[PDB]
Design a protein around this ligand. Structure first.
Ligand SMILES: N[C@@H](CCC(=O)O)C(=O)NS(=O)(=O)OC[C@H]1O[C@@H](n2cnc3c(=O)[nH]cnc32)[C@H](O)[C@@H]1O
Ligand SMILES: N[C@@H](CCC(=O)O)C(=O)NS(=O)(=O)OC[C@H]1O[C@@H](n2cnc3c(=O)[nH]cnc32)[C@H](O)[C@@H]1O
Lengths: 337, 335
């Protein structure tokens, strides 16, 4: 795979708004996230659509593609970070400068709707991109959870690329929709014990592919959807969906023969899942859809819309040890220097 | 293509609930639809999940597939009609009895989420199915709009298959969200003059393919999504979406090279579209996404979630005459 140079303290991070204009609509949280990273020593470059609005988005399709490309062209930038997702980053894909991305590999990071870009860039260039923090939702989060998000971000992106990396398990997590865009919290979020579950036995190792599942529907079938192959580990997460929608998306995967190929599935914790009174969780729905197909599942990985969020390279090998209840990166995912 | 026998007054219609359990949650409207069709002379057979609930759906994936299959096996049924959509009919696709459908073709009709079944059945069997009324939303509608829906349903499904069929244009329509499952009429729905527009010139003729666009995402990429081919007319409609979602779905089509293949696009009227204060309509968003590609578009065809609803065969040739502002079926679609 094509690898970006690693991050280091003091580096320059550029940020872009490929969909929702949250630098305007969540400006307090945006400023808190900016200050958070600056205090860590990072220099920030603001994408050209910062502070702009076109109703539901930051600008036209072409304006948004230009904003992103301009960060790729900047030789001082080590990391290109999404401000926030939305719905519309898939529109940009025909207009990204893939040749420039290949010539100037950088760490590209975000989540949610930005999956369309992470997956599309990988499909076109082979660059290992990252499912991880976006500036506003992730780094504008109030303590204590933001510190745990940051610890994973800095560990994954700055560590020496020698030997496997085994993920830590956050002690507590939350998905509450409070404390969004004001100076002070209303009240502390509920902190849940980590209820991640490992369904299966033994160890499965394979290339991880995926992201936000609902977002993948916007690139599915196209040259921008990475081909899923025998032995891959599928990583999928969704946010604020009804159980009805979750069944639909799992059945989409089934119809596409994905469950005939993959050797394991990672479900990210689902933010504020709506079970419609059934008390069912997503894993139970997946089990029905699987129709007897035995695939081991890591249910509740902390790489999703819940807080805190771990950073995950996409398109490299992971090993899930179902017996020891852990998950590791086993393939180099950044340049050694 | 594989063609079903035409409908006749007095035939038996069977109904099924492949997703939302609205025979329970919209029972008043359900009864209105049943009574409406019975008064027209039809006999109705209730699918086995009628009156059942499993929270957000009518039953398990397998039981829903069985409900549908049992209607296919019933020799008395000439039309299989959806009760209502939802989100989940794509789940049934591995379990439908496609061989039985081929062996005794019937009229299969519905819309919205049921697109997954209409499209999947066509992909597997070549059967010409119908984007059209579902029992509860369509035939449980109060007069006067229900009468216009019915007029199209009966015309399309009973007419002799000789010469082209040119659609009538409903004079007025509505998408107002009132008088759903209430027993009394607060008042008639607000009625709007028909604002359908023909963007283009000349005449375009090609096989129509599509349905509810959001629903197509649940079958996309699979063997159940019919291949879109050079010359097709793409028919798409959506309901109650944000402009953000509409842009995403149009861009999905673009990324899939759909706009390099199609000869025209039909946009169904979009029920209660949310433009996020932009004042933009779906056609304007499509125009941006097309990035200069000159595809003629019929914007606002009355085959969608708005009332009244026309009945449209899928998988046969239509001719859109942009100069004369009309649309016709030009290929035989019933036996
Ligand atoms: N959720 C996907 C869209 C795709 C999908 O959901 O299927 C997305 O792109 N989200 S996003 O724009 O990046 O938002 C990221 C996070 O930001 C959170 N968020 C956004 N606005 C608000 C808010 O007003 N209050 C609380 N939380 C908010 C939201 O709960 C989500 O977890
Ligand atoms: N909307 C698609 C799903 C595809 C999608 O929208 O992404 C669908 O399957 N719809 S449906 O379950 O068949 O609903 C059909 C119609 O039923 C109407 N409806 C349902 N419940 C209500 C209600 O409570 N009030 C008013 N109208 C309602 C609504 O206007 C919609 O047009």
């Amino acid at each position: 795979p094509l690898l970006a140079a690693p991050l280091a303290v003091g580096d320059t991070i550029g940020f872009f708004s490929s969909s929702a204009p949250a630098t305007v609509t969540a400006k307090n949280r945006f400023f808190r996230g900016v200050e958070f990273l600056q205090r860590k020593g990072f220099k920030l470059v603001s994408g050209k659509l910062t502070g702009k609005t076109d109703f539901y988005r930051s600008g036209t399709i072409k304006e948004r593609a230009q904003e992103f490309n301009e960060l790729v062209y900047n030789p001082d930038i080590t990391c290109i970070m999404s401000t926030i997702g939305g719905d519309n980053s898939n529109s940009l894909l025909p207009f990204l400068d893939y040749d420039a991305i290949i010539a100037n590999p950088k760490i590209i990071i975000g989540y949610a709707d930005t999956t369309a870009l992470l997956a599309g860039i990988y499909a076109k260039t082979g660059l290992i991109t990252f499912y991880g923090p976006a500036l506003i939702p992730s780094f504008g989060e109030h303590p204590p959870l933001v510190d745990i998000t940051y610890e994973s971000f800095i560990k994954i992106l700055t560590r020496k690329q020698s030997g496997i990396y085994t993920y830590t398990l956050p002690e507590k997590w939350s998905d509450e929709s409070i404390n969004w865009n004001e100076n002070k919290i209303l009240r502390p979020k509920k902190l849940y014990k980590n209820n991640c579950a490992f369904y299966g036995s033994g160890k499965v190792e394979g290339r991880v592919i995926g992201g936000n599942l609902n977002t993948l529907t916007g690139i599915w079938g196209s040259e921008w959807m990475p081909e899923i192959r025998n032995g891959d580990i599928l990583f999928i997460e969704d946010s604020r969906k009804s159980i009805a929608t979750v069944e639909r998306l799992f059945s989409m995967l089934k119809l596409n023969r994905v469950f005939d190929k993959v050797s394991a599935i990672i479900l990210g914790k689902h933010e504020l899942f709506d079970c419609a009174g059934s008390k069912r969780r997503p894993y139970e729905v997946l089990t029905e859809v699987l129709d007897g197909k035995q695939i081991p599942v890591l249910d509740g990985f902390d790489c999703s819309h819940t807080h805190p969020m771990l950073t995950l390279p996409l398109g490299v090998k992971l090993a899930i040890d179902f017996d020891n209840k852990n998950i590791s990166i086993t393939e180099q995912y950044l340049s050694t220097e």
